[PDB]
Amino acid sequence: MSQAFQRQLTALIGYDVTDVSNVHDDELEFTRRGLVTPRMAEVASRDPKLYAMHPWVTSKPLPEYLWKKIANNCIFIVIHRSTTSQTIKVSPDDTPGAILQSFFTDFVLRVCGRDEYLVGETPIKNFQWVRQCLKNGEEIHVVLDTPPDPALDEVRKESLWDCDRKFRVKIRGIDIPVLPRNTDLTVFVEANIQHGQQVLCQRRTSPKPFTEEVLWNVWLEFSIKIKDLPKGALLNLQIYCGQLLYYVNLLLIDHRFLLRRGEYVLHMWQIFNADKLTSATNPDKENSMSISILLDIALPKAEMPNQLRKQLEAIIATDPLNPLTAEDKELLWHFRYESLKHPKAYPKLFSSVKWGQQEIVAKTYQLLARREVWDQSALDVGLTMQLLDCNFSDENVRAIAVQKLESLEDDDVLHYLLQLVQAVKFEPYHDSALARFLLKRGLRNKRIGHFLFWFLRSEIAQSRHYQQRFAVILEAYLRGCGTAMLHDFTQQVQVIEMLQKVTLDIKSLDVSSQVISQLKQKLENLQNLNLPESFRVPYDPGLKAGALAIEKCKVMASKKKPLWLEFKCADPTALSNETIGIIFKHGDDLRQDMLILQILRIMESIWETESLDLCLLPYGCISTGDKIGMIEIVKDATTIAKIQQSTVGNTGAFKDEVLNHWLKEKSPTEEKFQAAVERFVYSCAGYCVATFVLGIGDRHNDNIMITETGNLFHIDFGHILGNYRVPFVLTPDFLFVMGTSGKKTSPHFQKFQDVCVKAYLALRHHTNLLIILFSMMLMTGMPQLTSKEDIEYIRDALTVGKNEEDAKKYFLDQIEVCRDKGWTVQFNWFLHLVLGI
Numbered sequence: 001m002s003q004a005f006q007r008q009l010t011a012l013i014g015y016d017v018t019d020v021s022n023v024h025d026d027e028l029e030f031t032r033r034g035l036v037t038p039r040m041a042e043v044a045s046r047d048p049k050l051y052a053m054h055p056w057v058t059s060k061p062l063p064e065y066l067w068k069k070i071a072n073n074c075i076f077i078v079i080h081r082s083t084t085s086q087t088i089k090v091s092p093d094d095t096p097g098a099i100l101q102s103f104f105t106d107f108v109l110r111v112c113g114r115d116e117y118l119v120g121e122t123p124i125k126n127f128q129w130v131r132q133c134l135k136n137g138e139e140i141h142v143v144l145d146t147p148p149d150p151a152l153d154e155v156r157k158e159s160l161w162d163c164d165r166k167f168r169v170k171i172r173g174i175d176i177p178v179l180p181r182n183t184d185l186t187v188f189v190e191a192n193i194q195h196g197q198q199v200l201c202q203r204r205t206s207p208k209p210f211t212e213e214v215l216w217n218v219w220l221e222f223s224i225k226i227k228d229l230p231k232g233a234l235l236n237l238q239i240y241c242g243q244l245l246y247y248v249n250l251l252l253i254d255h256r257f258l259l260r261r262g263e264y265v266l267h268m269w270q271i272f273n274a275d276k277l278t279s280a281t282n283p284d285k286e287n288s289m290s291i292s293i294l295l296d297i298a299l300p301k302a303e304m305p306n307q308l309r310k311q312l313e314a315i316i317a318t319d320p321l322n323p324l325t326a327e328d329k330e331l332l333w334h335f336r337y338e339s340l341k342h343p344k345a346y347p348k349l350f351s352s353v354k355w356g357q358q359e360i361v362a363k364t365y366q367l368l369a370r371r372e373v374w375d376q377s378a379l380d381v382g383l384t385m386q387l388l389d390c391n392f393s394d395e396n397v398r399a400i401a402v403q404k405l406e407s408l409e410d411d412d413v414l415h416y417l418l419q420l421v422q423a424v425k426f427e428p429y430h431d432s433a434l435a436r437f438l439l440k441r442g443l444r445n446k447r448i449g450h451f452l453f454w455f456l457r458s459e460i461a462q463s464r465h466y467q468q469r470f471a472v473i474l475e476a477y478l479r480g481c482g483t484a485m486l487h488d489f490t491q492q493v494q495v496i497e498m499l500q501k502v503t504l505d506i507k508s509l510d511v512s513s514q515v516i517s518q519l520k521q522k523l524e525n526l527q528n529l530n531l532p533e534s535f536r537v538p539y540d541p542g543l544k545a546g547a548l549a550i551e552k553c554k555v556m557a558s559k560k561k562p563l564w565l566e567f568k569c570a571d572p573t574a575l576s577n578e579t580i581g582i583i584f585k586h587g588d589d590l591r592q593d594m595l596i597l598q599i600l601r602i603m604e605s606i607w608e609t610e611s612l613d614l615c616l617l618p619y620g621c622i623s624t625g626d627k628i629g630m631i632e633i634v635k636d637a638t639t640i641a642k643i644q645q646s647t648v649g650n651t652g653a654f655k656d657e658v659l660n661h662w663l664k665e666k667s668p669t670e671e672k673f674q675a676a677v678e679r680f681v682y683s684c685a686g687y688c689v690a691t692f693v694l695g696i697g698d699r700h701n702d703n704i705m706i707t708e709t710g711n712l713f714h715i716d717f718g719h720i721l722g723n724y725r726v727p728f729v730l731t732p733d734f735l736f737v738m739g740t741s742g743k744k745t746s747p748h749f750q751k752f753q754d755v756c757v758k759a760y761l762a763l764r765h766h767t768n769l770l771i772i773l774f775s776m777m778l779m780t781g782m783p784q785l786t787s788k789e790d791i792e793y794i795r796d797a798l799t800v801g802k803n804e805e806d807a808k809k810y811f812l813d814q815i816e817v818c819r820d821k822g823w824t825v826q827f828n829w830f831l832h833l834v835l836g837i
């Protein structure tokens with residue numbers, strides 16, 4: 001042993017994976033070593049040319065709505081070379097390699113103005129880019145040039161079951177330097193032996209006056225035998241006053257299958273939040289509450305009656321958040337071999353396991369050894385995800401879920417990457433099948449790797465609870481992604497580190513000339529001999545930002561003073577001259593927004609399977625650090641509030657016809673207008689459903705935007721989530737566009753209802769998928785929204801356990817609730833947010 005290298009990694013990671021200042025064992029270093037094999041295996045087995053060109057493809061059928069967009073078996077592609085330019089007809093079913101020969105009669109077709117290649121043996125209609133142009137009504141322009149040298153992607157060269165005694169732990173005492181100014185209070189230590197949120201046993205100390213030092217010197221003996229402890233069980237240590245104030249966790253079985261042994265001084269965390277599960281200890285040793293404990297062995301590795309079958313089937317059919325009674329679990333377990341025949345029973349069945357009994361666990365492994373129907377079943381992501389949530393601590397169970405994820409194609413790993421990374425928070429151990437899966441899939445595909453880096457880095461920078469685990473995973477990735485990516489990552493971070501500083505300096509300073517002048521001045525200096533001459537857009541990797549357009553850069557008139565930034569595209573082969581627009585904002589935990597936007601993408605894909613295209617606009621958004629990150633500026637967009645602020649202003653005097661007026665104005669040909677009107681109808685219904693199902697529908701119209709072409713979309717998800725009546729936003733102005741007012745109707749309004757109904761019942765067809773992603777989303781991403789009531793909102797919103805007919809009438813009623821309310825809620829939002837009442 002690389003020093004200037006481990007230094008670079010550290011800077012890329014934002015955390016030093018060699019720092020053992022905050023550990024009580026070697027699990028992290030052990031994980032560092034373990035991840036060497038998965039990394040090397042994958043780097044050794046990846047195609048250099050495929051890896052360098054990263055074809056973005058899918059094997060899904062071309063949506064019905066995209067088929068119609070095609071005339072005959074014909075698709076035109078415009079090819080560019082030096083100065084020449086010739087369009088070429090194509091069949092949606094032929095490879096790019098064939099199209100190439102149809103052009104002449106070693107170059108590769110790269111998209112103009114993007115790092116995106118149409119390569120490989122896939123039909124041209126199956127490249128995500130081609131599907132994007134078709135949908136948008138944009139034309140496919142490619143440049144013909146030489147393939148990227150794979151040389152650039154070079155990687156730098158390098159017995160428990162015999163101890164029948166009851167488990168015990170001695171609580172020595174707790175220590176905190178300065179305690180709250182709240183005299184006096186009383187405290188006790190609660191110690192829980194946990195396994196997948198199942199409390200196997202629980203003991204508390206006696207009450208003791210809450211002083212800066214509290215000594216008990218008491219042994220807590222549990223009802224559980226040491227030989228019954230399950231791998232992955234936690235000693236959960238909590239301090240209560242008299243309310244929960246502090247918590248810390250310690251793994252009972254360690255990463256080498258060894259019973260935890262000895263003296264511990266654990267710095268605790270201060271108060272279904274996933275943070276509560278971490279086995280990491282507080283880094284702040286000088287302020288944090290401390291607990292002292294002492295411990296004291298290696299862990300080895302007839303026909304159903306009809307009424308019962310019905311009962312079992314009714315159990316298996318309930319939603320993932322439906323509670324199991326003791327009776328349900330006993331039925332499940334008793335009939336485990338029959339349950340094993342239904343992949344959908346698996347989560348509930350493995351919830352029926354008494355993990356605190358060695359003999360039960362042994363039988364459960366006997367179950368898992370009889371896994372043929374599971375391995376033969378078609379991938380069901382919703383079902384798999386349920387095995388990776390907070391209810392399962394057994395790694396054999398969680399491993400069969402990851403095994404199913406193995407068959408995902410790149411495009412689908414992208415769809416689910418954010419929440420897969422978040423699900424690492426539910427892993428008992430730092431080294432897990434899931435972590436290695438993410439690592440492997442990131443090293444296999446540059447597009448996946450890019451988002452993995454940023455998803456990980458985002459958590460490493462604002463989560464003390466998990467930064468250590470995540471940082472170890474990011475390092476393994478950075479050691480195999482290759483030089484070219486390393487550099488691009490380095491550039492991006494340098495750029496963002498500079499833009500971040502500028503944002504803060506500006507905030508410290510209506511936007512007066514002084515703050516405007518400072519912004520432009522600061523941006524001038526950076527651009528002058530300070531900022532890299534090109535960097536990839538973290539939310540749109542194929543895109544490369546060039547130089548700032550300081551003329552268009554401005555400080556937005558918001559209370560957190562977001563930077564509105566403009567860039568030219570560095571790629572000269574870029575047709576248009578449109579700038580690349582990035583909002584740069586401090587003050588919000590944009591991770592929440594990220595999660596809402598990711599769900600939006602999942603809802604669209606769901607709709608796609610039903611050949612439906614509600615027209616959501618899930619803009620790019622990346623959390624880069626502590627309460628900071630970037631947001632994609634959508635072109636040609638104004639806020640619904642501003643649209644109406646024109647005709648009026650100060651007074652909350654909303655007018656009904658204004659929105660429609662604005663759409664007519666913004667359409668050159670009267671034909672474009674009717675399309676915009678239709679686009680409005682679909683994106684409106686899409687947002688009413690999506691927003692209703694997520695519970696974020698009641699918005700002030702300043703947080704709802706619209707495109708010149710009629711694409712409605714919600715923004716500012718952080719604000720509502722952070723401060724969390726009408727079921728969604730469908731106001732007189734929206735209704736007017738569809739051609740209705742009061743006790744009336746319209747073709748477009750009939751259309752609206754219909755679409756909502758379709759969209760909605762379609763989401764219900766994936767109820768389980770939606771419920772598990774929603775549940776996880778709250779637990780790992782919105783701490784302030786992790787109460788029992790919070791997690792369960794979506795059960796009601798999806799009207800779980802209802803006919804499509806009952807469900808349909810339910811949503812229609814919701815549409816009618818909006819009608820009856822008119823501008824009433826908007827008026828209220830205005831009073832509050834615009835002035836303050």
Ligand SMILES: c1cc(-c2ccnc3ccc(-c4cnc5[nH]ncc5c4)cc23)ccn1
Binds near residue numbers: 619631633634716717
């Ligand atoms: C000015 C501009 C915009 C805007 C225009 C175009 N595209 C956009 C994309 C995203 C956002 C947006 C979304 N969520 C946000 N949270 N905080 C700022 C923030 C900004 C905003 C935009 C929205 C409101 N006022």
